Design a protein around this nucleic acid. Structure first.
Length: 85
DNA sequence: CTCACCCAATCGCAATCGCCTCACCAGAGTGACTCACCTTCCAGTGCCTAGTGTGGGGCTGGCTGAGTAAGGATGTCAGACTTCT
């Protein structure tokens, strides 16, 4: 860590074979894929509103632009259009 | 001037179809076996040649009669004699 080194011994190590997947990975730019994208952004926006101390709760746009910098700001505006002004 | 919203365009994903390929099923042909029919051979039975019994239909000798006749072989006696008792 930042403060120093720490040492443990280990005695047990597992080898994991070939995985049998139980969850389907979406494809690039698929409906489910981009749905998760806008949902991840909406959840982050709600949790930034919960963390806000001023009443009424207010956030800044460039916090979201620091978190999601590949997003066009039209999509972030779209998420903030409902629930904020 | 800057920001936000709306519209348009492009890309990606999903669904449907699309025509070609593969697989399965069915039918036909091929090969062998079995069965049936025909043909041939053999065997048996039923009549033609050969070898024959038994007989028809002729055919010719034999038959007392009494007379004329011979030697005739055959024999029935008849006697004389030699053997046995």
């Amino acid at each position: 860590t930042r403060q120093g080194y720490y040492i443990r011994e280990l005695v047990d190590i597992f080898v994991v074979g070939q995985q049998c997947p139980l969850f389907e990975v979406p494809g690039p730019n698929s409906k489910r894929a981009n749905t998760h994208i806008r949902d991840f952004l909406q959840v982050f926006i709600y949790r930034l509103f919960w963390k806000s101390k001023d009443r009424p709760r207010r956030i800044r746009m460039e916090d979201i632009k620091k978190a999601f910098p590949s997003h066009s700001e039209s999509s972030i505006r779209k998420r903030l259009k409902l629930c904020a002004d």
